[PDB]
Amino acid sequence: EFRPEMLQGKKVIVTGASKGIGREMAYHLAKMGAHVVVTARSKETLQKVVSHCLELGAASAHYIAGTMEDMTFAEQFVAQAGKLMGGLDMLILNHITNTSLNLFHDDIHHVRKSMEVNFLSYVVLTVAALPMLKQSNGSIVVVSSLAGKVAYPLVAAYSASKFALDGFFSSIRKEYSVSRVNVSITLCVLGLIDTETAMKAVSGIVHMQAAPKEECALEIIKGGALRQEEVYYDSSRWTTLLIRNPSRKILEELYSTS
Amino acid sequence: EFRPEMLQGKKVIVTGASKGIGREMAYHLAKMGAHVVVTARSKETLQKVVSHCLELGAASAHYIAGTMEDMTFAEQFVAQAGKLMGGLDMLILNHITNTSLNLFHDDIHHVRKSMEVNFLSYVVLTVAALPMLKQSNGSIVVVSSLAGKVAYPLVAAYSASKFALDGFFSSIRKEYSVSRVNVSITLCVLGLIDTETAMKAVSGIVHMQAAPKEECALEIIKGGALRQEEVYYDSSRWTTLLIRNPSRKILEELYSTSY
Numbered sequence: 465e466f467r468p469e470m471l472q473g474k475k476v477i478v479t480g481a482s483k484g485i486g487r488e489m490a491y492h493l494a495k496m497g498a499h500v501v502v503t504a505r506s507k508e509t510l511q512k513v514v515s516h517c518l519e520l521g522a523a524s525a526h527y528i529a530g531t532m533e534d535m536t537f538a539e540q541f542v543a544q545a546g547k548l549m550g551g552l553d554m555l556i557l558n559h560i561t562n563t564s565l566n567l568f569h570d571d572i573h574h575v576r577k578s579m580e581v582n583f584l585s586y587v588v589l590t591v592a593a594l595p596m597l598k599q600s601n602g603s604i605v606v607v608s609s610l611a612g613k614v615a616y617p618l619v620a621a622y623s624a625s626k627f628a629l630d631g632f633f634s635s636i637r638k639e640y641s642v643s644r645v646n647v648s649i650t651l652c653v654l655g656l657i658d659t660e661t662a663m664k665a666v667s668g669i670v671h672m673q674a675a676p677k678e679e680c681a682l683e684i685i686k687g688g689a690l691r692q693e694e695v696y697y698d699s700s701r702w703t704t705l706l707i708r709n710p711s712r713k714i715l716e717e718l719y720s721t722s
Numbered sequence: 723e724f725r726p727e728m729l730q731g732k733k734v735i736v737t738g739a740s741k742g743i744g745r746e747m748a749y750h751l752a753k754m755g756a757h758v759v760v761t762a763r764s765k766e767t768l769q770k771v772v773s774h775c776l777e778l779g780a781a782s783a784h785y786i787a788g789t790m791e792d793m794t795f796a797e798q799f800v801a802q803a804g805k806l807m808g809g810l811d812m813l814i815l816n817h818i819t820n821t822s823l824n825l826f827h828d829d830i831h832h833v834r835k836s837m838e839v840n841f842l843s844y845v846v847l848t849v850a851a852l853p854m855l856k857q858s859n860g861s862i863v864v865v866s867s868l869a870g871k872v873a874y875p876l877v878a879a880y881s882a883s884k885f886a887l888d889g890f891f892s893s894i895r896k897e898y899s900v901s902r903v904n905v906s907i908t909l910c911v912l913g914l915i916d917t918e919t920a921m922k923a924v925s926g927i928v929h930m931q932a933a934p935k936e937e938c939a940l941e942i943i944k945g946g947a948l949r950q951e952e953v954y955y956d957s958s959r960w961t962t963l964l965i966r967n968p969s970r971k972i973l974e975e976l977y978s979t980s981y
C-alpha cells in the first residue's frame with residue numbers, strides 16, 4: 465500500500481542521523497524528493513550525510529548538531545528545523561546515548577543519562593513539534609527495540625528508557641484519539657540491526673543474525689507514512705509473531721468502553 | 723502456601739507509607755510482628771502510622787521523613803533504615819509523585835518529576851539497599867500498575883515511569899539469575915485500589931469500581947514473601963487473565979534457553 469510518491473516534498477526531521485539507522489533513513493528519504501533535517505552531536509559527519517542526501521536527490525537537506533542531553537537544545541532544534549522547512553509533517557525520533565552490553569552494577573549516572581537522552585528528549589521534542597505537527601496532521605515515529613517490549617539482561621537502563629517510550633507514546637496516542645488530535649504515533653520495535661554500533665557492541669552473543677539497516681530504515685519510514693501504531697522489524701519471522709500482544713489491545717479497549 | 727509466621731521478625735522498609743497501599747502494607751506487616759521502617763514527606767502522618775503499627779504488634783516501627791525528588795535523601799534513607807534494623811530483609815518501593823488524571827499538554831516538568839520519584843528513586847534505593855539485601859538474601863518489591871503494562875489516556879507520565887520500572891527491574895532480575903545474586907525482584911501490577919488518593923483522582927473522571935486496599939496490600943506482601951516475579955491484583959478476574967503476557971514470557975525464555 466506504501467508509495468515513495470507519498471514522501472515527495474514532505475517536511476521530515478530525523479534525530480540520530482550521523483550514523484546507524486538514522487543515516488539510512490535520511491538516505492532513504494533522499495529519493496524522488498523530501499525535505500529532511502538531520503541531528504546528532506558529530507558536526508562534520510552530519511555535513512557529510514547532508515551532502516550525500518542532496519546527491520541522492522533530496523528536496524532540501526539541513527543539519528543542526530548538538531547533544532540531546534541538554535533539553536533546551538532539543539526545543540531550539542525543532543524551532544529552527546521548523547523554520548528551515550516552514551512546517552513539519554513527520555518527526556522521527558531515533559537517537560540514543562551510547563550503551564554497552566554490561567551487568568548493572570551501580571551506575572545511576574548512566575540510568576539518568578539513558579532516561580534523559582533515550583526518553584525525556586523524545587518527549588521534549590514531541591512537545592516542541594506538536595503545534596507544527598497539529599497543523600500539518602503529521603506523524604511522530606518513535607524508534608524503540610525488542611528490549612522496549614521484553615526483558616534482556618545487560619541492557620537494564622536501555623530497556624528502562626525504551627519501555628518508558630511505549631508507556632508514554634502509547635498513552636498519548638489513546639489521548640489523541642479521544643481528544644481528536646489528528647497526529648499519528650508510530651512505535652517501532654526492532655531486533656538486532658547490522659549497524660556498526662551494534663556490531664561493535666555484540667560479543668559473546670551472535671551477531672551473525674543481525675538484520676540489514678537498509679531494509680529496517682525503509683520499513684520504519686513506510687510504517688510512519690502508512691500511519692501504523694507499531695512496526696515490527698526482525699531477522700526472525702518467529703520473533704515477529706511472538707512480539708505482538710493481543711491481551712494488551714483487549715485490555716486497552718476494555719477500558720475504552722467508559 | 724504463604725504464612726504470616728514467615729514475616730515475623732523480618733526487617734522491612736515500606737516507602738510511601740503515610741497513606742494509601744503503603745500504610746495498609748505497614749499495617750499488615752505490623753500485625754505480622756516484623757520490623758518496619760516507613761517513609762514519606764508528611765512528618766506527623768508518619769508518626770501516626772508508626773504508633774498504630776506498634777499497637778498492631780510490630781517488632782519495631784520507625785519513620786524517616788523526606789522527599790524522593792532529592793536523590794541524596796534516598797541513599798541517606800536506606801543507610802539510616804539499615805542502621806535502625808541492623809539489616810534489611812525486604813525493600814518495598816511503593817511511593818509516587820502526586821498525579822492527577824489529565825490530558826498531556828506540555829508539562830515536561832511533570833514527566834521529569836514522575837521519572838525522578840516513580841522511577842530513578844527506586845533504582846537509587848535498590849542500589850543503596852543491594853549490599854544489605856545481598857547478605858540477607860532478601861527481596862525487592864516494586865509496586866507497579868495496569869498502566870505499567872498497558873496504555874491508558876490521562877496517565878502518560880505515570881505510565882512512562884511504571885513502564886520504566888518493568889523495563890529496568892525485569893531486566894536486572896534476568897541479570898541476577900545469570901550472575902547468581904540471591905535477591906528477589908517482585909513486580910506488582912495493580913488495577914484501581916479504594917485508596918482515598920485514587921478515589922479522589924477518579925471520582926469526577928470515569929470511576930471503574932476499585933478493589934479493597936486491605937486485600938491488595940496483603941497480596942503484595944504475600945508475593946514478596948513467596949518470591950514471585952509478578953503479582954496481579956484487580957477487582958476483575960477478566961482483567962487479571964488479560965494482563966498476563968504469555969508471548970513476552972515465551973520470547974524472554976526463548977532467548978534464555980539459547981544463551
Ligand SMILES: NC(=O)c1ccc[n+]([C@@H]2O[C@H](COP(=O)([O-])OP(=O)(O)OC[C@H]3O[C@@H](n4cnc5c(N)ncnc54)[C@H](OP(=O)(O)O)[C@@H]3O)[C@@H](O)[C@H]2O)c1
Nearest residue numbers: 480481482483484485504505506531532609656657659661
Ligand atoms: N541496531 C540494533 O541492534 C538496534 C536494536 C534495537 C533498536 N535499535 C534502535 O535504532 C536506533 C538507531 O540505532 P543505531 O543502531 O543506528 O545506533 P548508532 O549508530 O549508535 O546511532 C545513534 C545515533 O544517536 C546519536 N546520538 C548519540 N548520543 C547523542 C546525544 N547525546 N545527542 C544527540 N545525538 C546523539 C548518534 O550521533 P552522535 O554520536 O553523532 O551524537 C547517532 O547518529 C536507536 O534508537 C536504537 O535504539 C537498534
Ligand SMILES: NC(=O)c1ccc[n+]([C@@H]2O[C@H](COP(=O)([O-])OP(=O)(O)OC[C@H]3O[C@@H](n4cnc5c(N)ncnc54)[C@H](OP(=O)(O)O)[C@@H]3O)[C@@H](O)[C@H]2O)c1
Nearest residue numbers: 738739740742743762763764789790816867914915919920
Ligand atoms: N490505588 C490505585 O488506584 C493504584 C493503582 C495502580 C497502582 N498503584 C500504586 O500503588 C502504590 C500506592 O499508591 P496509593 O495511591 O495507594 O497511595 P498514595 O496515597 O497516592 O500514597 C503516596 C505515598 O507516597 C508519598 N509521597 C508522595 N509524594 C512524594 C514525594 N515526592 N516524595 C516522597 N514520598 C512522596 C506520600 O506521602 P506524603 O504526601 O506524606 O509525602 C504517600 O505516603 C503506588 O506505587 C501506586 O503507583 C495504585
Ligand SMILES: Cc1cc(C)n2ncc(C(=O)N[C@@H]3[C@@H]4C[C@@H]5C[C@H]3C[C@@](O)(C5)C4)c2n1
Nearest residue numbers: 562563564609610611622654655656662665
Ligand atoms: C543483544 C541484543 C539482542 C537482540 C535480539 N536485540 N534486539 C534488540 C536489541 C537492541 O536494542 N540492541 C541495542 C543494545 C545492544 C547494542 C545494539 C543496540 C544499541 C546498544 O547500545 C548496543 C544497546 C537487541 N540486543
Ligand SMILES: Cc1cc(C)n2ncc(C(=O)N[C@@H]3[C@@H]4C[C@@H]5C[C@H]3C[C@@](O)(C5)C4)c2n1
Nearest residue numbers: 719821867868869874912913914919920923
Ligand atoms: C485511568 C486508569 C485506568 C485503569 C484501569 N487503572 N488501573 C490502574 C490505574 C492507576 O494506577 N492509576 C493511578 C493514577 C490515577 C489514580 C489511581 C492510580 C494512582 C494515582 O495517584 C491516582 C494516579 C488506572 N487508571
